[PDB]
Amino acid sequence: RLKAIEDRLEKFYIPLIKAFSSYVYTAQTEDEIETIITCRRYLAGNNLLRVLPMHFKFKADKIAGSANWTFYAKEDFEQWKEALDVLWEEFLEVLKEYYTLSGTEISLPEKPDWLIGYK
Ligand SMILES: [Ca+2]
């Protein structure tokens, strides 16, 4: 099943990676992240589920036109930094698995800067 693995990439890994690394942001983004980390946990690997926070909306905001997520508590910033790094490692493995299965050539993307801060 190429489809099963494509759904993990398209419905979980890619949107969550983009939410924390691409400049795209809407009035729906915090709720979309909440949805990914609750409703779409069934698409995550067990390693990531160990560290992925359950809650996000009330822990951070984008302020002043910045692309950065501003965390209010250092501890939440640290939890998210750790989880994003795990998310990225899982993502690259799921990409490798997709290409192993599809038989096509690997173009592994470079890791982005996480758009997160607290200080
Ligand atoms: Ca918020």
UniProtKB/Swiss-Prot annotation:
Annotated organism of origin: Archaeoglobus fulgidus (strain ATCC 49558 / DSM 4304 / JCM 9628 / NBRC 100126 / VC-16)
Annotated localization: Cell membrane
Cysteine pairs bridged by disulfides in the record: none
Keyword Membrane attached: yes
Topology relative to the membrane: Multi-pass membrane protein
Protein name: Uncharacterized protein AF_0924
Entry GO CC: plasma membrane
Keywords (A to Z) from UniProt: Cell membrane, Membrane, Transmembrane, Transmembrane helix
